[PDB]
Scaffold this motif. Structure first.
Motif, PDB file in Angstrom:
ATOM      1  N   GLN A  83       0.831  -1.197   0.000  1.00 48.44           N
ATOM      2  CA  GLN A  83       0.000   0.000   0.000  1.00 48.44           C
ATOM      3  C   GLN A  83       0.867   1.247   0.000  1.00 48.44           C
ATOM      4  O   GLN A  83       1.767   1.397   0.824  1.00 48.44           O
ATOM      5  N   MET A  84       0.608   2.104  -0.976  1.00 41.66           N
ATOM      6  CA  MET A  84       1.395   3.298  -1.220  1.00 41.66           C
ATOM      7  C   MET A  84       0.458   4.509  -1.289  1.00 41.66           C
ATOM      8  O   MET A  84      -0.475   4.545  -2.100  1.00 41.66           O
ATOM      9  N   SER A  85       0.702   5.509  -0.454  1.00 41.96           N
ATOM     10  CA  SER A  85      -0.127   6.705  -0.484  1.00 41.96           C
ATOM     11  C   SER A  85       0.713   7.958  -0.758  1.00 41.96           C
ATOM     12  O   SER A  85       1.938   7.873  -0.901  1.00 41.96           O
ATOM     13  N   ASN A  86       0.042   9.096  -0.900  1.00 40.15           N
ATOM     14  CA  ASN A  86       0.690  10.350  -1.250  1.00 40.15           C
ATOM     15  C   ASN A  86       1.664  10.173  -2.404  1.00 40.15           C
ATOM     16  O   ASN A  86       2.823  10.571  -2.315  1.00 40.15           O
ATOM     17  N   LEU A  87       1.174   9.558  -3.475  1.00 40.37           N
ATOM     18  CA  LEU A  87       2.008   9.219  -4.622  1.00 40.37           C
ATOM     19  C   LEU A  87       2.541  10.450  -5.335  1.00 40.37           C
ATOM     20  O   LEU A  87       1.810  11.401  -5.586  1.00 40.37           O
ATOM     21  N   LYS A  88       3.821  10.410  -5.674  1.00 40.64           N
ATOM     22  CA  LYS A  88       4.457  11.534  -6.356  1.00 40.64           C
ATOM     23  C   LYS A  88       4.768  11.069  -7.762  1.00 40.64           C
ATOM     24  O   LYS A  88       4.865   9.868  -7.990  1.00 40.64           O
ATOM     25  N   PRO A  89       4.897  12.015  -8.713  1.00 44.07           N
ATOM     26  CA  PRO A  89       5.271  11.661 -10.086  1.00 44.07           C
ATOM     27  C   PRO A  89       6.542  10.825 -10.086  1.00 44.07           C
ATOM     28  O   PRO A  89       6.659   9.905 -10.890  1.00 44.07           O
ATOM     29  N   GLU A  90       7.461  11.127  -9.168  1.00 39.50           N
ATOM     30  CA  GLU A  90       8.730  10.393  -9.047  1.00 39.50           C
ATOM     31  C   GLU A  90       8.571   8.938  -8.597  1.00 39.50           C
ATOM     32  O   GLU A  90       9.530   8.166  -8.638  1.00 39.50           O
ATOM     33  N   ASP A  91       7.366   8.560  -8.180  1.00 37.99           N
ATOM     34  CA  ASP A  91       7.087   7.173  -7.810  1.00 37.99           C
ATOM     35  C   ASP A  91       6.814   6.304  -9.056  1.00 37.99           C
ATOM     36  O   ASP A  91       6.535   5.102  -8.945  1.00 37.99           O
ATOM     37  N   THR A  92       6.830   6.927 -10.235  1.00 39.31           N
ATOM     38  CA  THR A  92       6.586   6.214 -11.484  1.00 39.31           C
ATOM     39  C   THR A  92       7.708   5.211 -11.706  1.00 39.31           C
ATOM     40  O   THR A  92       8.884   5.569 -11.614  1.00 39.31           O
ATOM     41  N   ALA A  93       7.353   3.959 -11.956  1.00 35.93           N
ATOM     42  CA  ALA A  93       8.350   2.920 -12.192  1.00 35.93           C
ATOM     43  C   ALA A  93       7.692   1.577 -12.408  1.00 35.93           C
ATOM     44  O   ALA A  93       6.492   1.416 -12.209  1.00 35.93           O
ATOM     45  N   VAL A  94       8.488   0.607 -12.826  1.00 36.92           N
ATOM     46  CA  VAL A  94       8.017  -0.753 -12.841  1.00 36.92           C
ATOM     47  C   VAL A  94       8.301  -1.305 -11.451  1.00 36.92           C
ATOM     48  O   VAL A  94       9.440  -1.277 -10.994  1.00 36.92           O
ATOM     49  N   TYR A  95       7.259  -1.779 -10.772  1.00 39.88           N
ATOM     50  CA  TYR A  95       7.405  -2.354  -9.432  1.00 39.88           C
ATOM     51  C   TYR A  95       7.437  -3.862  -9.507  1.00 39.88           C
ATOM     52  O   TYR A  95       6.584  -4.475 -10.138  1.00 39.88           O
ATOM     53  N   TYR A  96       8.440  -4.448  -8.876  1.00 34.94           N
ATOM     54  CA  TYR A  96       8.646  -5.882  -8.885  1.00 34.94           C
ATOM     55  C   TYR A  96       8.508  -6.406  -7.480  1.00 34.94           C
ATOM     56  O   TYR A  96       8.982  -5.778  -6.543  1.00 34.94           O
ATOM     57  N   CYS A  97       7.879  -7.551  -7.296  1.00 34.30           N
ATOM     58  CA  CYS A  97       8.023  -8.174  -5.994  1.00 34.30           C
ATOM     59  C   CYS A  97       9.034  -9.311  -6.084  1.00 34.30           C
ATOM     60  O   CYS A  97       9.262  -9.894  -7.145  1.00 34.30           O
ATOM     61  N   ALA A  98       9.666  -9.586  -4.961  1.00 37.99           N
ATOM     62  CA  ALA A  98      10.779 -10.513  -4.901  1.00 37.99           C
ATOM     63  C   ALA A  98      10.607 -11.347  -3.662  1.00 37.99           C
ATOM     64  O   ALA A  98       9.884 -10.953  -2.760  1.00 37.99           O
ATOM     65  N   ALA A  99      11.229 -12.515  -3.648  1.00 33.60           N
ATOM     66  CA  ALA A  99      11.190 -13.371  -2.478  1.00 33.60           C
ATOM     67  C   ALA A  99      12.517 -14.069  -2.314  1.00 33.60           C
ATOM     68  O   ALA A  99      13.313 -14.163  -3.252  1.00 33.60           O
ATOM     69  N   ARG A 100      12.766 -14.533  -1.102  1.00 25.51           N
ATOM     70  CA  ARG A 100      13.955 -15.307  -0.819  1.00 25.51           C
ATOM     71  C   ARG A 100      13.596 -16.206   0.334  1.00 25.51           C
ATOM     72  O   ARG A 100      12.694 -15.911   1.111  1.00 25.51           O
ATOM     73  N   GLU A 101      14.305 -17.315   0.418  1.00 26.89           N
ATOM     74  CA  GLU A 101      14.162 -18.242   1.506  1.00 26.89           C
ATOM     75  C   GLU A 101      15.031 -17.712   2.630  1.00 26.89           C
ATOM     76  O   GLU A 101      16.192 -17.360   2.409  1.00 26.89           O
ATOM     77  N   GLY A 102      14.479 -17.650   3.833  1.00 24.11           N
ATOM     78  CA  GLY A 102      15.232 -17.102   4.935  1.00 24.11           C
ATOM     79  C   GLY A 102      14.884 -15.640   5.104  1.00 24.11           C
ATOM     80  O   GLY A 102      14.296 -15.014   4.223  1.00 24.11           O
ATOM     81  N   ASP A 103      15.243 -15.095   6.250  1.00 23.30           N
ATOM     82  CA  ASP A 103      14.867 -13.736   6.602  1.00 23.30           C
ATOM     83  C   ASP A 103      15.688 -12.645   5.917  1.00 23.30           C
ATOM     84  O   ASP A 103      16.694 -12.913   5.257  1.00 23.30           O
ATOM     85  N   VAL A 104      15.228 -11.410   6.046  1.00 24.19           N
ATOM     86  CA  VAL A 104      16.056 -10.261   5.699  1.00 24.19           C
ATOM     87  C   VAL A 104      16.204  -9.370   6.955  1.00 24.19           C
ATOM     88  O   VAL A 104      15.563  -9.615   8.006  1.00 24.19           O
ATOM     89  N   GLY A 105      17.076  -8.369   6.875  1.00 28.27           N
ATOM     90  CA  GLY A 105      17.344  -7.537   8.040  1.00 28.27           C
ATOM     91  C   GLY A 105      17.576  -6.129   7.579  1.00 28.27           C
ATOM     92  O   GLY A 105      17.480  -5.864   6.388  1.00 28.27           O
TER      93      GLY A 105
END
Length: 126
Positions: A81-103
């Motif tokens: 969820q993304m609010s207060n969208l700016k023109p600079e937020d224009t892009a291709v959005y990708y989701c990614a996954a990995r096994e194990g946590d991130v920090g």
């Protein structure tokens, strides 16, 4: 296993959007998933990420207090969820996954995620 994103499209500046990233089956349900974006002419940068074991999230300075992640366990889907969208937020959005946590360090490196959705275009215009 596949990640399938949805929810891209044209959005008014100041407006909000919700992207979805559905993982096949029960994939990554206790691992880490993240969102990256690729602006025109630029390499991918991280937006936000979540450790599905616990639910702690991490985000780029540019979206702090603006972009949040939610989770639907039944549908094995996470949402940006993304609010207060700016023109600079224009892009291709990708989701990614990995096994194990991130920090707070590792979540931001794209090479840390071996699984990727197809990308969805987000265009912020009035």
């Amino acid at each position: 296993v596949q990640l399938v994103e949805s929810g891209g499209g044209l959005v008014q500046a100041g407006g909000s959007l919700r992207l979805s990233c559905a993982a096949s089956g029960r994939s990554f349900s206790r691992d880490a998933m993240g969102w990256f974006r690729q602006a025109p002419g630029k390499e991918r940068d991280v937006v936000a990420a979540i450790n599905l074991n616990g639910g702690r999230t991490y985000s780029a300075d540019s979206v702090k207090g603006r972009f949040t992640i939610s989770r639907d366990n039944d549908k094995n889907t996470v949402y940006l969820q993304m609010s207060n969208l700016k023109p600079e937020d224009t892009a291709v959005y990708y989701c990614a996954a990995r096994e194990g946590d991130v920090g707070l360090v590792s979540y931001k490196r794209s090479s840390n995620y071996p699984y990727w959705g197809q990308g969805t275009q987000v265009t912020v215009s009035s």
